Amino acid sequence: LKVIVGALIHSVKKLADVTILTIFCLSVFALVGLQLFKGNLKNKCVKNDMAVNETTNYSSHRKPDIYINKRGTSDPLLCGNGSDSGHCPDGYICLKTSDNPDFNYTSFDSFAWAFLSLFRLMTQDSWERLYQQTLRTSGKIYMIFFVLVIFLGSFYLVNLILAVVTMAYEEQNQATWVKLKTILFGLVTDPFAELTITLCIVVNTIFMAMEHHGMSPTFEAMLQIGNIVFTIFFTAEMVFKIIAFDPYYYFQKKWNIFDCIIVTVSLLELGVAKKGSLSVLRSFRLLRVFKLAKSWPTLNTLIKIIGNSVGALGNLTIILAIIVFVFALVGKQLLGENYRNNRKNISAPHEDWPRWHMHDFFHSFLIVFRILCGEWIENMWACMEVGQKSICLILFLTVMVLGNLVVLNLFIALLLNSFSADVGWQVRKTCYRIVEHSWFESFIIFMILLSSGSLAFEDYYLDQKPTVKALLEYTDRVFTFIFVFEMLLKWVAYGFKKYFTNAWCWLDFLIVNISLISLTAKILEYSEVAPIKALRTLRALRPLRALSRFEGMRVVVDALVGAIPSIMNVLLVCLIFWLIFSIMGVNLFAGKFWRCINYTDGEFSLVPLSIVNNKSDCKIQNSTGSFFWVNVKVNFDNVAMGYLALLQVATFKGWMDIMYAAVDSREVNMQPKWEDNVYMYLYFVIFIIFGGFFTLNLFVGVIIDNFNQQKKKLGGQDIFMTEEQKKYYNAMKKLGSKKPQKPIPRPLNKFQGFVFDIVTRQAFDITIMVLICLNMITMMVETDDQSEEKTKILGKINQFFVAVFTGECVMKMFALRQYYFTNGWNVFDFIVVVLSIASLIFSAILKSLQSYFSPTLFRVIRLARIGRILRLIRAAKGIRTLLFALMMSLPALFNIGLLLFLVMFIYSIFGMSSFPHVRWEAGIDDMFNFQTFANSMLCLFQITTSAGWDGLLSPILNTGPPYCDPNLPNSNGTRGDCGSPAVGIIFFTTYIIISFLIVVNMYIAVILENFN
Amino acid sequence: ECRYWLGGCSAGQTCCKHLVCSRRHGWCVWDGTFS
Ligand SMILES: *[C@@H]1O[C@H](CO)[C@@H](O[C@@H]2O[C@H](CO)[C@@H](O[C@@H]3O[C@H](CO)[C@@H](O)[C@H](O)[C@@H]3O)[C@H](O)[C@H]2NC(C)=O)[C@H](O)[C@H]1NC(C)=O
Ligand SMILES: *[C@@H]1O[C@H](CO)[C@@H](O[C@@H]2O[C@H](CO)[C@@H](O[C@@H]3O[C@H](CO)[C@@H](O)[C@H](O)[C@@H]3O)[C@H](O)[C@H]2NC(C)=O)[C@H](O)[C@H]1NC(C)=O
Ligand SMILES: *[C@@H]1O[C@H](CO)[C@@H](O[C@@H]2O[C@H](CO)[C@@H](O[C@@H]3O[C@H](CO)[C@@H](O)[C@H](O)[C@@H]3O)[C@H](O)[C@H]2NC(C)=O)[C@H](O)[C@H]1NC(C)=O
Ligand SMILES: CCCCCCCCCCCCCCCCCCOC[C@@H](O)COP(=O)(O)OCC[N+](C)(C)C
Ligand SMILES: CC(C)CCC[C@@H](C)[C@H]1CC[C@H]2[C@@H]3CC=C4C[C@@H](O)CC[C@]4(C)[C@H]3CC[C@]12C
Ligand SMILES: CC(C)CCC[C@@H](C)[C@H]1CC[C@H]2[C@@H]3CC=C4C[C@@H](O)CC[C@]4(C)[C@H]3CC[C@]12C
Ligand SMILES: CC(C)CCC[C@@H](C)[C@H]1CC[C@H]2[C@@H]3CC=C4C[C@@H](O)CC[C@]4(C)[C@H]3CC[C@]12C
Ligand SMILES: CC(C)CCC[C@@H](C)[C@H]1CC[C@H]2[C@@H]3CC=C4C[C@@H](O)CC[C@]4(C)[C@H]3CC[C@]12C
Structure with missing residues (x-):
């Protein structure tokens, strides 16, 4: 048993530092979420008795909770009083209720609930739901918390886990008859x-x-x-x-x-x-x-990938299947009876059964497959509602923890065992010196960054802002004119050939052209024709000039372009391997998706089988003008629609809506019946295994080996970094390489004499660490529904801990004579004990009622105690090393992040104009829409992780009633409130791919900066 | 008549069990269940 004990300790040791960092960062962000968000998830639009009553209208008050469900769902509408929060409809008030959303499981109101919410944010499991609820209640400007906890923690910590798995394998590999004429x-x-x-x-x-x-x-x-x-x-x-x-x-x-x-x-x-x-x-x-x-060498590589999965690495691809089946068996045997008995609680209002159950062995396998695909919160909610919560909790996390790691482990193993084995000349010189001057580069960059920011203000509300329209219109005209004159100056200075053989000045030749044809069309006639509108929609790619005029942008784009042939080859091989499944799914489900529904109040009800069975039944039962024979918006009806459906299934967004229509489909022109073709789930399980795992492994491997080839060819770290950034990287390495330290001259004088010794003691530092630990747990035990007695005790203990920290800081300032300020971490401690003091003093001052004191400002100011626990980074050497690697990557991370922000900005300005009048259907809300720049950025940050792009595209896919409304009185622009199908498809698909590419760029950058 | 997994039919009769004739080319196949 010593052998297996050693195997277990090694397996945890390879992931020990990363696991401790994950739990630490998750706990810290759970504290941040608890402190900023608490009770705002209980903010339902409770109705008031708006009409007056002659007698008291609160006689009973036992059931006055008249909630208003969110349009298109059976969930109450959340709200907030803040200006940036979600506002109640007319006739309702926002009130603190006693129930959190999602069966009273999704909340920030306690430590455990916040920890679960932050774990779900890390795993990205429908995080855009917690994000939309929180920005509905707290406010839009709180999107910053989610950006911080997505870029950090989730992205960075998944990078660290993936790199830890990769390092462990590579270590493992290092250890390794007249018919004859016819x-x-x-x-x-x-x-x-x-x-x-x-x-x-x-x-x-x-x-x-x-x-x-x-x-x-x-x-x-x-x-x-x-x-x-x-x-x-x-x-x-x-x-x-x-x-x-x-x-x-x-x-x-x-x-x-x-x-x-x-x-x-x-x-x-x-x-x-x-x-x-x-x-x-x-x-x-x-x-x-x-x-x-x-x-086709890439097709051969994919075939070899599949074979190596089924061949030499069958030892690990048989482990995947066997753990999936064991999970299915245990889950069915433990929860199928509960799923069957209490299906009434977890079913849709019109269904006798939930879509995803564990009743059979097929459905338990299916939920395990969904868990391994990375969707476990909703099924965990349903499974906790019906069955025992502790048993449900253990199974869903264990399958998510064990199941996801072995998928990644086999992904990495397959990624190495299948991939690693005159006057004119005077004017010309004048233009040369003018355009090569130092005041012509910083000026052009500033102008480019002011042409970028000027696009964000051209929103739906620009009509409501009258003078802003003219201001923006003449800031764009003058900017385009100056850019045209700058281009003419460059043409005069340099040669036409020198202009035309560059990979960047062409990009800005194109931007100038589109802007100059837009303005020319506006000046001339035909300015209102559809081609000219199409040309004017292209103004969102003007920010691409900053891609050329910034050296980091140039470097990152050149690095990604160096891999363009590999990217195109993998695109071609993936496309055709997906063509097989597109045609197969078309043959399976072509025309079998349509159905009849009841359109009552923007709420669609599937007509039951007893009254409707056919396209002709649904019409002979059209007594009320509310029976609609409509198709599922993501269907296998053409090869193109088939591939948008394949992309949704691979990205795991829109996944259920396709898996339901396909499975329930019976025949053509015949009403879908519950689970009539229940084994089309097997089909979807086979296109996700193959067109997901294997094509993604092929893409990764190809991109890695291209980037490794470039890295070994240059022999330099400047794949994404700059020259000055490389010097700064050397400076940071020198900071890390500072192993020797000068011992402090001990104060001989009695004042500071024994104080220095008692301060520099191991007992002193362990005491401070454990005190930080108790303080962490003290702010950890802080619930929403807390007594005023509890709030007073918490404030008293916070004051005591602030006083102790200030005493320690002053003691170190006194005993240690400016060598306290010498050390960087001591400086951090000082600044985080001067911020705690300032926060306490400011809270006391505001509590004296000098002016309005919003509790949210108290919560924000109370975040300043985050330093008291961020001081624990020193205690964990592994956490310190991983944070140092993060800091090392921050140059390249900043470069690729600025590229991603530029692409976000471009797609945002695209959406603000192509999609302002689309109706709020499933992911589009009064808040998360494309009518203003902040809302567009909320949506685009959300879908940069590909989360909810199905929800934000489905309202675009609407082309007529009952889902939308051609000829709507207001919003006459985009044919009422129906979206453009092709434009939305191109937008969302290209954006998710392009950012899948740039996120892989950041991932490989962080991993290669961790290797060094 | 009644040609099991032979792709026959092509006449005015059907085939007995789990078997129906087809459109265009006239063949009767195991449509009802596995052949
Ligand atoms: C699944 O759904 C069923 C039905 O919707 C739920 O049954 C309900 O359970 C509650 C809590 O036990 C019952 O309330 C209590 O009932 C009795 C009086 O009938 C008494 O103990 C209390 O005064 C209280 O009212 C409720 O009556 C009962 N409803 C029905 C229709 O049976 C069940 O709890 C849900 N279970 C799961 C595991 O999801
Ligand atoms: C879906 O399919 C068709 C339309 O595509 C519907 O056909 C109708 O089927 C009913 C029920 O079989 C027929 O009623 C018949 O009436 C008498 C006496 O009841 C007798 O001939 C049969 O026993 C049967 O009940 C009806 O005539 C027929 N309508 C036609 C052929 O125009 C069908 O109802 C739809 N729904 C279902 C559930 O099949
Ligand atoms: C049951 O009767 C109702 C009431 O007439 C039908 O609703 C109608 O559905 C059609 C087809 O979806 C709609 O026509 C289309 O509408 C817009 C312009 O309004 C445009 O997309 C198309 O050019 C086309 O004209 C019609 O507007 C709509 N009317 C109402 C009042 O909702 C319904 O389709 C019938 N159900 C079945 C199953 O046939
Ligand atoms: C963020 C994703 C999109 C980023 C790219 C968007 C903008 C595209 C331009 C990016 C700049 C870098 C692209 C090219 C880098 C590779 C390096 C520069 O590419 C040189 C090519 O323009 C010409 O190729 P040749 O030198 O083989 O042929 C010369 C032929 N003439 C012109 C002399 C006759
Ligand atoms: C519907 C589909 C299958 C038919 C059309 C697909 C065509 C265009 C595909 C199928 C196979 C592909 C070829 C397979 C292999 C290679 C080798 C590579 O070094 C150059 C590209 C090239 C030559 C590909 C070009 C495009 C290609 C010919
Ligand atoms: C349930 C039904 C549809 C599944 C039947 C399998 C069908 C779909 C196909 C899919 C991929 C195919 C395999 C692809 C390649 C090879 C390698 C070859 O050297 C022997 C045959 C073998 C192993 C094929 C057997 C049949 C196969 C498994
Ligand atoms: C130092 C010890 C306590 C472990 C530190 C983690 C602490 C903060 C965790 C462990 C168990 C958690 C408690 C478990 C259950 C509840 C009941 C809930 O309705 C209020 C919060 C409360 C009371 C939790 C608060 C946070 C908690 C106390
Ligand atoms: C030269 C060879 C042996 C080196 C292989 C080890 C390293 C470079 C490999 C192994 C696993 C790889 C990672 C596998 C998974 C992902 C996530 C994907 O979305 C982008 C690429 C990325 C981030 C890869 C980066 C490089 C990687 C970490």
Whole structure:
């Protein structure tokens, strides 16, 4: 047992420092959340008796809680009194209720609730829900807490966990018969021989990609005769190569035995099976794309990735499946009866069952798969509601902890075992000196940064701000004119060839062009035509000039462009591996998504099976003008819609809405029935395993080895860093390399004599550390519904601890003579004991009622005690080292973060204009919309982690009633309140991909700065 | 008539169990259950 004990201690030791840092940072941010947010989740829009009553209207007051549910959901609308909070509708007041959202489980009102909320924010599990609730109640300007806890903790700590796993493996690797005439007549090998087969596969897959829901019978006949012709072609090729080759030699090879299986399936289904959910076998012909792997090195790499998963690393891919199945077994046996009995509590209002249960063994496997995909909070809420809370808590976290690590561990293992093995000339010189001057660079950067910021103010409310419109209109005109003149100056100074062979001055040639055609169209006629509107929407990419005029921006873009061929190759291989699933899903679910609903109050009710079964039933039961035959917005109805559905399934956003429609689908024109095709969940589990794990592993590996190649080619850290930033990096390394220290001259004089010794004592420092520990637990035990007796005690203890800290700081200032100020961490202690003093004094002054004293300002000021626990970084050497690595990465992190902020700004200015009038449906709220720049930035920060992009795109996908309203009296601009489908698709897909790229850039930067 | 997993049919009759004839080309297949 000593061997397994050593294995366990090593396994924890590799993750010991990162785990301690995770728990410490999570506890600190839990304290921050508790202190700033507490009770604001109990802020429901409780109604008042607005109309007067002759007699008392509070006779009972037992059930006066007239809540108002949020439009499109069965959840009460949250609110806040702050100016930046969410405001109640007319006739309602915001009140402190006694219930938190999400079955009274999502709250910041206590230590444990805050810890769970911060853990969920770390794991990113529907964090945009906690984020939208908190910004609904506390206020928009509190988005800063979420940015801090997303960029740090979540992003950085996932980086640290991933790098710890990678370091542990790499360590592990370091430790490591007249017919013979007809037979030879064959001669299959020929010019264009295998390339006539490759072309046939390409054309056949292109045929299959043209199947859709609304296809003419002639089109379907033409698409079936083509499939018949290609079956004939493949059968021909097979028999003609059987006769040409020897009876054993042909079937000796797996690449010919693969075609044998494919063609025998194509024969034994196209005539021995119907398409009664068996169109998947009709889609077995798509599997012939494996042939192109010989001419496609990246496709061969992906095939080798899958094989290594099933081959040498089968030892770890059999562990994944077996732990999933064991979790499923235990979960079903423990909670299926509770799920069945109490399904009434966790079901939708119109369903007898919840969508996600653990009743069967299939559904328990499915919830375990969802957990490993990274969605556990909602199912944990339902599972805690129905079954025992302690048993539910243990299972869901254990599956999330063990299940996610082994997926990452096998991801890393697969990432190394499959990837590492005259007057004119006078004027020309004048222009040269003018444009090369030091007052022509800082001026242009300032102007670029004032053309950026000027775009943020052109919002929906710009109509309500009349003078701001003219101000912005003439700050844009003058800026574009000055940019045009600056470009003309550069043209006069340098050569046209020197201009046109640069990778940046072209970018700004294009921005100048779009701005100059926009203004020219505005001056001239046709300014109100759709092409000119399209040209004027492109003004959001003007901030790309700061991408050229800043050296860090130049460096980061050049670094990412150095990997453009690898990126494009992986894009091509991923795209076509996803084409197989797109066509397969289209064949499975093409046209089977539509359904009838009841449109009552912006709340859609699925008509029950008894009254409606058909597109024709739903219409013969259209007594009230509220029965609507509508399609699910993300459908497998075309190849394009199929791929937007595949992207949503891979990104795990919009995932459930597709998994439900596909599974419930019975047939075409026939009403969906609950779990009629319950085994389409297996289909989705197979496109997520393959088009998720394996394509992502291929992309990672390819990007890593491109960046490693560039790093070893340059032999320098300046992949993303600058020259001055490299010097600053050297300065920071020197700070870290400062191992020797000068011993302090002990004060010989009696004053400070024994004081210095008692201060520099190990007993003294351990006492201060444990005192910090008690103080941490003291501010940790602080609940919302607390007695005034409890608040007084907490304030008294806070004052005592502040006094003790001030005494220690003054004692060190006295005994240690300016060598206290010599040390940086001692300086941090001094500043965090002068901030605690200032916060206490300010709280006392405000409590004297000098003016209005909002409790939120008291909470903000009370955050100043965060230093008293941030002082504990010294006590943990591992935490100190990881924080030092973070500080080391801050140059490159700042560069790539500024690139990400620039892309956020560009997409924000895009959204502010393309989508202000879209109706609030699922993720768009009065707050989280694209009518003002702050709201746009809230949405874009949210979807930079790809969270809620389905919710923010579904209102865009609306094209008519009952979901939206063409011809709405107000908001006449965007055809009422219906979104542009193609524009929204391009926006959200390109944004999530482009930021997936830039986040991978930050991830690899942090990891390679941790290696050094 | 009643051709099990042969892809026959092509006539005015159907096939017995889990078997129905098809559209376009006339073949009766194991549509009801597995072949
Ligand atoms: C799942 O849902 C059922 C039904 O919605 C819940 O049953 C309800 O449980 C509560 C709490 O025990 C009952 O209230 C109490 O009931 C009795 C009097 O009937 C008494 O102990 C108390 O005065 C109190 O009113 C409630 O009556 C009961 N409702 C029904 C319709 O049975 C159940 O608690 C939920 N359980 C889970 C595990 O989700
Ligand atoms: C969905 O499918 C079709 C429309 O696509 C609906 O067809 C209707 O089916 C009902 C019930 O089978 C037929 O009623 C019939 O009436 C008499 C006496 O009851 C008798 O012939 C049958 O026993 C049957 O009950 C009705 O005529 C038929 N309508 C047509 C053919 O136009 C069907 O109801 C829809 N829903 C379901 C649940 O099948
Ligand atoms: C049951 O009857 C109601 C009441 O007429 C039907 O609602 C109507 O649905 C159609 C098709 O969705 C709507 O037409 C479309 O509306 C807009 C312009 O309003 C535009 O997208 C299209 O050009 C088209 O005209 C119609 O406006 C809508 N009317 C109302 C009052 O809601 C409903 O479709 C019927 N249910 C079924 C299952 O047929
Ligand atoms: C944040 C994601 C988007 C970032 C990029 C957006 C802006 C694109 C421009 C970025 C600047 C860097 C791109 C290129 C870096 C690679 C290095 C610079 O690229 C040089 C190419 O422009 C020309 O390539 P050649 O030198 O092979 O051919 C010269 C042919 N002429 C021009 C002499 C006739
Ligand atoms: C439930 C049904 C649909 C699943 C049946 C499997 C079908 C879908 C396909 C998917 C990928 C295929 C595999 C792909 C490649 C190889 C390697 C080859 O050397 C032997 C056949 C083998 C191992 C194939 C067997 C059949 C296979 C597993
Ligand atoms: C519907 C689909 C399958 C048919 C059209 C896809 C075509 C364009 C795909 C299929 C295979 C692909 C090729 C496979 C391999 C290579 C080798 C690489 O070094 C250059 C690109 C090249 C030559 C690819 C170009 C694009 C390609 C030809
Ligand atoms: C130093 C010891 C106490 C551990 C430090 C963690 C402390 C702060 C944790 C551990 C258990 C937690 C308590 C467990 C249960 C409850 C009941 C809840 O309705 C109010 C908060 C309260 C009382 C929690 C407050 C925070 C708490 C006391
Ligand atoms: C030269 C080879 C052996 C080095 C391999 C070890 C390092 C570089 C590898 C192993 C695992 C890799 C990480 C795997 C997962 C991710 C998350 C992904 O979204 C971006 C890339 C990123 C962040 C990779 C960065 C580089 C990485 C840490």
